[PDB]
Amino acid sequence: SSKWLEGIRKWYYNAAGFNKLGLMRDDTIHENDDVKEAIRRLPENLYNDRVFRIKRALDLSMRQQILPKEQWTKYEEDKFYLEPYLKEVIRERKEREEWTK
Amino acid sequence: ATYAQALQSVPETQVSQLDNGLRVASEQSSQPTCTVGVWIDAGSRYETEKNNGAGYFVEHLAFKGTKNRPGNALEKEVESMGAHLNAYSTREHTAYYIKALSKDLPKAVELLADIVQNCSLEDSQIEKERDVILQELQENDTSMRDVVFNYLHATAFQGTPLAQSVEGPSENVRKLSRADLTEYLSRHYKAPRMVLAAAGGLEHRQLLDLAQKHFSGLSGTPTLTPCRFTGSEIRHREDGLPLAHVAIAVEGPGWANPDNVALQVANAIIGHYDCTYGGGMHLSSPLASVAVTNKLCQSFQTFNICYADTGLLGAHFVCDHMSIDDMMFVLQGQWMRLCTSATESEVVRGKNLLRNALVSHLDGTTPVCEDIGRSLLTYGRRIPLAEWESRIAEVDARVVREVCSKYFYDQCPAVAGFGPIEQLPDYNRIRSGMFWLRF
Amino acid sequence: HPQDLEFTRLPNGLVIASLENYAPASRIGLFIKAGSRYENFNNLGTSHLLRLASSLTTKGASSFKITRGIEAVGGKLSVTSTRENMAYTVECLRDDVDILMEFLLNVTTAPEFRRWEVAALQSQLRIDKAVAFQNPQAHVIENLHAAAYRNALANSLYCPDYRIGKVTPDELHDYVQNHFTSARMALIGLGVSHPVLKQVAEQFLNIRGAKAKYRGGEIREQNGDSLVHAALVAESAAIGSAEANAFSVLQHVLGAGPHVKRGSNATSSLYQAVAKGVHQPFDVSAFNASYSDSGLFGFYTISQAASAGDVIKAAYNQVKTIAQGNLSNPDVQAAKNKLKAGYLMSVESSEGFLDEVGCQALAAGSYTPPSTVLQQIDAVADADVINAAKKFVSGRKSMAASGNLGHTPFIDEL
Numbered sequence: 001s002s003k004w005l006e007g008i009r010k011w012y013y014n015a016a017g018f019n020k021l022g023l024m025r026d027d028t029i030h031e032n033d034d035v036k037e038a039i040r041r042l043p044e045n046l047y048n049d050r051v052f053r054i055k056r057a058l059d060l061s062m063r064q065q066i067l068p069k070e071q072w073t074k075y076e077e078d079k080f081y082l083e084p085y086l087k088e089v090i091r092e093r094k095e096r097e098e099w100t101k
Numbered sequence: 102a103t104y105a106q107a108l109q110s111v112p113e114t115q116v117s118q119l120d121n122g123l124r125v126a127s128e129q130s131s132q133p134t135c136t137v138g139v140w141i142d143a144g145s146r147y148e149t150e151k152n153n154g155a156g157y158f159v160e161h162l163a164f165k166g167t168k169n170r171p172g173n174a175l176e177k178e179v180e181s182m183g184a185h186l187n188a189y190s191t192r193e194h195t196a197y198y199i200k201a202l203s204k205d206l207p208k209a210v211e212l213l214a215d216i217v218q219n220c221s222l223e224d225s226q227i228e229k230e231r232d233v234i235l236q237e238l239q240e241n242d243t244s245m246r247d248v249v250f251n252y253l254h255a256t257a258f259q260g261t262p263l264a265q266s267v268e269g270p271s272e273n274v275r276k277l278s279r280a281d282l283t284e285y286l287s288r289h290y291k292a293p294r295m296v297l298a299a300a301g302g303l304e305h306r307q308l309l310d311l312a313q314k315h316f317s318g319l320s321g322t323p324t325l326t327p328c329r330f331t332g333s334e335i336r337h338r339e340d341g342l343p344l345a346h347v348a349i350a351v352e353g354p355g356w357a358n359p360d361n362v363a364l365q366v367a368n369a370i371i372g373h374y375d376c377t378y379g380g381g382m383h384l385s386s387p388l389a390s391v392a393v394t395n396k397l398c399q400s401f402q403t404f405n406i407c408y409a410d411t412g413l414l415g416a417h418f419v420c421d422h423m424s425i426d427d428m429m430f431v432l433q434g435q436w437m438r439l440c441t442s443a444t445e446s447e448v449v450r451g452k453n454l455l456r457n458a459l460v461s462h463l464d465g466t467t468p469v470c471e472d473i474g475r476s477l478l479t480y481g482r483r484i485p486l487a488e489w490e491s492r493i494a495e496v497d498a499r500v501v502r503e504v505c506s507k508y509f510y511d512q513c514p515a516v517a518g519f520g521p522i523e524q525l526p527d528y529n530r531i532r533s534g535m536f537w538l539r540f
Numbered sequence: 541h542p543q544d545l546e547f548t549r550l551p552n553g554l555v556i557a558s559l560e561n562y563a564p565a566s567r568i569g570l571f572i573k574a575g576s577r578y579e580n581f582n583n584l585g586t587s588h589l590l591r592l593a594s595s596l597t598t599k600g601a602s603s604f605k606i607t608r609g610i611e612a613v614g615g616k617l618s619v620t621s622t623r624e625n626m627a628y629t630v631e632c633l634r635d636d637v638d639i640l641m642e643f644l645l646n647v648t649t650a651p652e653f654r655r656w657e658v659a660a661l662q663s664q665l666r667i668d669k670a671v672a673f674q675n676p677q678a679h680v681i682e683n684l685h686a687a688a689y690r691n692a693l694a695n696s697l698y699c700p701d702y703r704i705g706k707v708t709p710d711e712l713h714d715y716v717q718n719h720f721t722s723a724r725m726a727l728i729g730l731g732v733s734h735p736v737l738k739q740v741a742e743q744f745l746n747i748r749g750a751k752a753k754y755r756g757g758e759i760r761e762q763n764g765d766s767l768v769h770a771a772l773v774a775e776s777a778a779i780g781s782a783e784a785n786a787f788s789v790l791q792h793v794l795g796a797g798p799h800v801k802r803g804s805n806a807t808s809s810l811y812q813a814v815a816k817g818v819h820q821p822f823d824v825s826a827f828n829a830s831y832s833d834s835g836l837f838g839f840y841t842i843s844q845a846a847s848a849g850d851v852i853k854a855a856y857n858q859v860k861t862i863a864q865g866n867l868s869n870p871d872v873q874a875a876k877n878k879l880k881a882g883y884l885m886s887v888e889s890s891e892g893f894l895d896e897v898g899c900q901a902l903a904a905g906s907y908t909p910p911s912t913v914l915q916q917i918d919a920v921a922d923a924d925v926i927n928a929a930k931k932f933v934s935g936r937k938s939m940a941a942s943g944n945l946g947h948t949p950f951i952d953e954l
Contacts, residue, residue, distance in 0.1 A: 041656050095604060107564035107634060131541055134885050161802060173806045179799070180807040183877035185885070186800045202881050233802075301888075377668050379619070380595030381660075383607040450612060457614035457633060460564050465889030486564075 013075045020066045021057045024073055026082035034093060038086040046081055108487040114473065115305045116483070121321050122293035125312050126473050126483070127305040135301040136466040137209050137308075138198025139217055140474030143289035145192050145265050146408075147324050154234075154269020155277060155285045156195060159220070160188045161230045162282075163197065166221045175212060182208060192254070192267060193408060196474055200467060203302045210311040217295075218319055220286060222279050231275060238271055245346050248337075249417065249519050253348045256335040257413060257515035261328045292321025296477045300470035328411050332513030334528045338521070344399065345422045345520040347429075349531075351512045353405055353412030356479045362492050363504040364405055364414055367439055369458065370451040371403040371416070385450060388435045397424045397431070409479065413515075414508060422521035429526060433534045440505045441537065448498045455493065460486065511536045545897070546734045547907050553723030553748070556741055557901050558734045566731035567631040567890055568644060571898040573724040574715075575624045576695040577831070578749050583711045585665070585699025590715065591626065592664055594619050596657050599650035603657070606643055615640050617647075623685070623693065624831060625899060629891065634731055645744050651716045653709040662705045669698045680769045680840075680942050683759040685829075688773055688836060688938035690755035722747040726902035730894060751833045754936070758950065761942035768848040768943040771827060772856070772954070773838030774935040776928070779830045780904060785917065786924040787837050790932075791826035792875035792882075793867065793925065794839065794859065799878075807874060809862070810839065810855050817854035820844055824855055832903065837932055845944035849953070856954050863929035872922055879917055884910070 013019060018028050027050060029035055042050070060067065116126045145156050164186070166172040179186055184201035197216055201209045241247055255264040268274070297316070299308045330352040354360040374389040381393035392398050401418035420428050462468055463486070476483035514535070518525050526534075545559040576587045594617060597603045610617055615632030617640075628648065630640045673679050678697075686694045699707070722745055729737050754775045777783040795808030805811045810824045823842040829835060839859070843851045887893045887910065901907050941948055 041654075043655075092602060092604065095602065099604070099608060102562065102634060104564075104633075104635065107562060110562040132888055134888050164800060164803060173804065176800050176803055176806055180805075180878070181874050183874065183881040184799065185881075186803075188801060200885060202877075202884065377671050379592055379664075380603070380607045381664075383595070383604045385608060385611040450614075453612065453614040457616075460633060461616070461631065461890075464563070464565060 010075050018057075019072050019074065021060050022053055022067055022071060022073060023057055024053070024078040025080055027053050027057070029082065029086075034089045035086060038082060038089045041085050041089075042082075046079075104490065108485075108490060111485060111487070114483045114485070116477065117309055119309075119312055119316065121316070121319055123295065123297065123312065123316055123319070123321075124293070124477055125297040125299075125309060126477055127299045127303065127308045128301075128469060128473060129305065130300075130302060132466075133203045133302045134466060135201050135203050135206060135209070135299065135303045136198060136470040137201065137206070137213065137297075137299045137303075138196055138470060138474065139213060140296045140298055140478060141195045141197075141290060142193065142294040142478045144190050144195050145267050145269070146262055147289060148262065148265060148269075148285075150265075151273070152277070152281055152285060153265050153273045154267075155282055156190050157268045158230065158234065158274075158277065158282060159286060160190045160195060160197070161234060162222065162226060163188065163216050163220055165226045165230070166223060167215045168219045168221055169215060170212070171221070172223075172226075175216070178208070179212065184209065190267060192263065192265070194475065194478060196471070198298075198467075198470065206303055206307060207311055210308075210315055214315040214319075217290065218316075222282060224279065227279060227282075234268065234274055235271065238268055238274065241268070245342075245344070245519060246417075246419075249346045249348050249517055252335050252337065252517035252519065253350055253413070253415070253515060256333045256517055257330060257350060258328055259331045259333065263328045263408065263411075291319070294478075296474050298470050298473040298477070300473060301466045325409060328408075330411065330515075332515050334514075334516040334518075334531075336516075336518040336522055336525065338523070339519070340521050340523075342520045344419055345425055345518070345522050345525070346417075346419050347425060347519075347522065347525060348415060348417040348517045349432075350406075350413035350415035350515050351509060353407055353414040354508070355410045355412050356407050357410070359492055359495070360504050360508070361405070361407060361412075362489075363496060363501055364508065366448065366451040366455055366493075366496060366501055367505055368403055368405050368414070369454040370439065370447060371435060372454070373400075373402040373404075374398075375400045386435075387438075388431060391431055392428070395427075397421075397428045401428075401432075403432075407479075422524065425522060425524045426526055429531070430534060433531075436505075436509045437537050440502060440510045443498055443502050443505075445498045448496070448501055451501075452493055452496065456490075459489065545907070547901065548734065548738070549905070550738070550741065552746070553721070554725040554727065554741060554745065555901050555905070556727045556729075556734065556737045557897065557907065558729035558732055558737055559897070560733055561731060563731055564633060565631055565890060566634040566637050567629060567729070567894055568637070568641060568732065569726075569728040569730075569894045569898050570628040570644060570648060571726040571728065571902050572626045572628070572648075572720060573624060573902065574626050574719040575621055576697060577623050577692045577752070578719055579692070579695050579715075580749075583707070583715060584695065585703040585707055586711050586715050587621065587626075587695075588665055588669075588697070588699040589658070589661060589707050590712065591619050591621050592661050592668065593653065593657075593712075594628070594647055596647075596661075597652050597654065598646035599652060601643065601646045601650075606646070609639060610643060613639060617643075620895075621697065623695070623697065625902070627895065627898065629894060631890070637732055637736075641740055645740065648720065649745055649747065651713070653712040653716075655709055658707075658709055658712070659705075662707075665699050666704050669704075672698060676763075676765070676767070676769055676942060679761070680771055680940055683761065683942070684771045684773055684836075684938070684940040687757045687759040687940050688755060688775070689752050689834075691752040692750055693752040693831060693834065694755075720747065726898050728894060728898040728901070730890065752831075754834065756936040756938055758939040758941070760940075760945055760948075762945060763942050764944050765942075766845050766944060768843050768845055768941065768945065768948060769841070770843075770848060770852060770941040770948060771838055771840045771939065772852060773827065773836045773938050773940070774932050775834060775938075776828070776837035776932065776935075777830070777835050778833055779835060782916070782920055782924065783928065784830055784835065785920050786928040787828055787835075788879055789872065789875050789917075789920055789925050790928050791828040791837070792878045793862070793871060794826040795824065796826060796878070796882075809871075810858055813858040814851050814854045818843075818847060818850050820847065820851075822851055824851065837928075838938075846947065848948050852949060852954060859929060860933055863926065863933045865926055867922075867925070869922060872925065876917060876920070880914055883913065883917070
């Protein structure tokens with residue numbers, strides 16, 4: 001029951017493929033004005049690590065080579081870092097909507 | 102306490118008439134101070150072309166020597182009893198008022214009647230004040246906002262006496278001799294057109310008795326045509342200045358309409374913004390929200406001015422020379438949004454802003470006594486604020502959008518520009534932006 | 541009028557006072573001892589960034605809800621600051637006191653100060669400083685209070701040139717946590733009842749530097765604006781005492797702002813002395829600034845660029861010859877009537893009364909009624925005035941000047 005769901009989530013994260021290129025969960029986020037706001041509200045060192053991981057991912061899709069096995073960012077050691085910023089952005093957007101309604 | 106409580110409990114503005122048409126008015130409260138003035142319904146609207154500027158000239162010479170208290174005895178007695186003294190003159194109204202202490206009521210009434218009806222004109226004083234008024238003309242040339250409003254009146258009422266500026270043109274300043282000034286003083290200030298207004302901790306009986314004493318012998322015993330609202334565009338291009346100043350007005354209703362209350366609600370919605378305010382992106386006006394979001398303008402104030410059965414329904418913005426047209430487009434968009442599909446909630450916000458601004462303005466002594474003067478001259482009666490609450494309760498979204506479709510929508514503006522205004526549109530672009538085909 | 545003002549010090553430390561009148565506008569003032577004089581040489585301009593930070597998100601209310609709710613009830617939320625006190629003044633009509641009370645509590649005692657809003661507020665700081673110092677008077681007075689104290693009164697009202705952008709929310713949290721305490725707060729109400737304020741401040745606050753020495757010196761500014769401004773200022777007196785009352789009597793003897801518009805100021809003595817001496821378009825006024833530990837007395841002149849020196853010498857000889865025992869007692873009575881008028885007519889309107897009552901309750905920890913203040917202004921004697929002017933003469937000077945300074949005496953040539 002419990003770990004069966006965990007088995008599904010860990011298998012899907014292995015078979016996604018972005019972990020093989022040195023990415024974490026919040027380096028492949030779709031951008032609207034909300035997520036552009038959340039990226040604008042980041043700290044500095046995480047933003048520098050974000051642009052470095054993105055630049056390595058674009059290099060390793062430029063020569064289309066996957067990282068060796070030992071440097072793949074596995075499940076449950078990644079940072080789910082963008083979640084509170086993006087959460088507050090969506091809360092403020094719904095706040096504007098449901099206030100002007 | 103509620104609005105019925107706080108609006109029933111209000112002082113009463115007891116008025117009376119002395120038998121010269123002298124309209125006298127008092128209002129009592131518990132603070133130990135007084136504000137006593139003479140409001141006079143005679144400005145520059147009543148002056149012809151050859152006598153432009155004599156009113157401003159009188160309110161310079163009105164403290165510079167009477168017959169009984171000569172040149173410095175007036176100011177010596179005033180600052181020896183310790184009071185403030187002040188005067189102004191708009192294009193219609195002119196006020197001399199003393200902010201004084203409560204125990205100095207009879208001396209203030211005596212000095213004030215001596216200022217009104219016994220001004221001497223010594224030619225040394227006329228030489229001094231000719232030079233001083235020329236220097237103040239050259240001083241007020243620098244303040245760009247008053248230059249803009251004088252442009253706006255002089256292009257909105259082209260030809261009528263209402264286009265005359267307050268100070269008058271400078272060649273009409275340096276040529277007025279003494280006889281024209283004596284004729285001015287002996288014509289305008291007589292019987293019905295002066296109100297002895299008195300707010301603050303005084304007694305109405307004493308104020309009526311002092312008027313009865315000192316204003317005896319004044320002995321007072323033929324104007325006000327309607328005016329033409331032309332609608333035009335004046336631009337004064339000067340490219341060596343850092344800011345562009347643009348005013349634009351359409352015709353307002355005047356003093357005697359409930360449409361004045363409706364347009365006060367509308368201009369309370371649009372209203373004011375300045376560059377130093379706190380909280381930019383989230384302001385209630387959509388105009389202000391866009392203008393902070395894209396940094397268009399430095400400031401604006403969108404407002405109403407009423408004259409005797411006319412008026413400007415105006416908006417005045419000080420913006421940079423690169424974004425005049427964008428600010429212009431967003432301003433006319435907000436006008437037409439309030440003209441066509443303004444909902445109820447923003448009208449309720451406008452009514453709250455109107456109540457708060459009115460009540461917070463009519464507080465203290467000096468705005469109260471200013472209100473007494475301008476409320477007995479223009480209306481004929483000072484309206485208690487419960488009746489303003491009634492006329493606010495007679496306003497919903499329907500009346501607002503119908504009256505704004507009656508006044509803003511599809512008229513000929515008076516546009517007045519000063520500064521770097523190359524990007525200011527030509528007049529037919531203001532017209533094609535005024536109305537909607539739903540754009 | 542059965543309701544005079546009420547006054548209660550709650551023994552956690554703070555002071556709640558009120559005045560229930562039947563005026564339709566309700567004001568809530570909250571006065572805090574957190575002005576510029578409680579900073580050090582490392583967080584300058586934190587007062588200014590704190591002053592422009594009324595509309596930031598609080599623990600319990602985001603900034604959008606704050607701004608739209610305040611302007612939906614249409615109350616004015618203003619922040620006024622002197623070098624001792626900040627003051628959060630929120631006013632409205634009496635039907636919406638509770639929601640603005642809640643937002644006042646939010647902005648005071650739920651501070652967050654997130655970083656991106658702080659950066660936007662840095663840009664706001666620079667524009668506000670520009671709009672403030674387009675007047676010459678502010679820059680002259682700030683160089684004045686910089687040239688007359690080596691210490692905590694030499695902190696500016698405004699953030700300086702270089703600290704714009706380099707003040708961080710760490711210093712904001714620090715300054716809020718150790719200068720907003722429950723003993724440095726006066727909650728003043730105009731139009732509200734005392735038990736409502738007692739409920740508010742009893743439920744929802746629950747929280748819990750160095751004296752300034754005289755320095756002596758001068759600061760000049762070459763600005764070339766064809767109007768020499770010059771302030772000549774010496775140390776006079778701390779606040780609260782009849783010494784400070786005697787210096788107030790002395791400034792109304794010397795000369796204040798023009799009571800008569802477009803007048804001649806024939807009651808003021810300094811203007812008559814300089815007008816006998818100099819025939820120019822000029823201006824001379826007195827300058828009494830007062831603070832807790834100290835205070836300044838001096839004069840403040842605006843002149844043309846040619847002959848500022850003759851102006852300042854004539855005014856200095858006039859103050860010396862009043863100090864050596866040459867004045868009239870009806871001139872003292874005219875000065876006292878001017879001071880009575882100034883005090884009774886600075887508390888007519890709403891905001892002036894709020895400021896007077898709140899500072900009067902906060903500083904001395906207790907209220908004093910206006911009538912006995914008039915009585916104590918009456919009780920000041922004449923030898924006190926002569927001794928205050930002698931204390932101005934016998935003290936070390938301090939000068940701040942700006943403009944085209946080609947003909948200005950420095951210290952000795954005064």
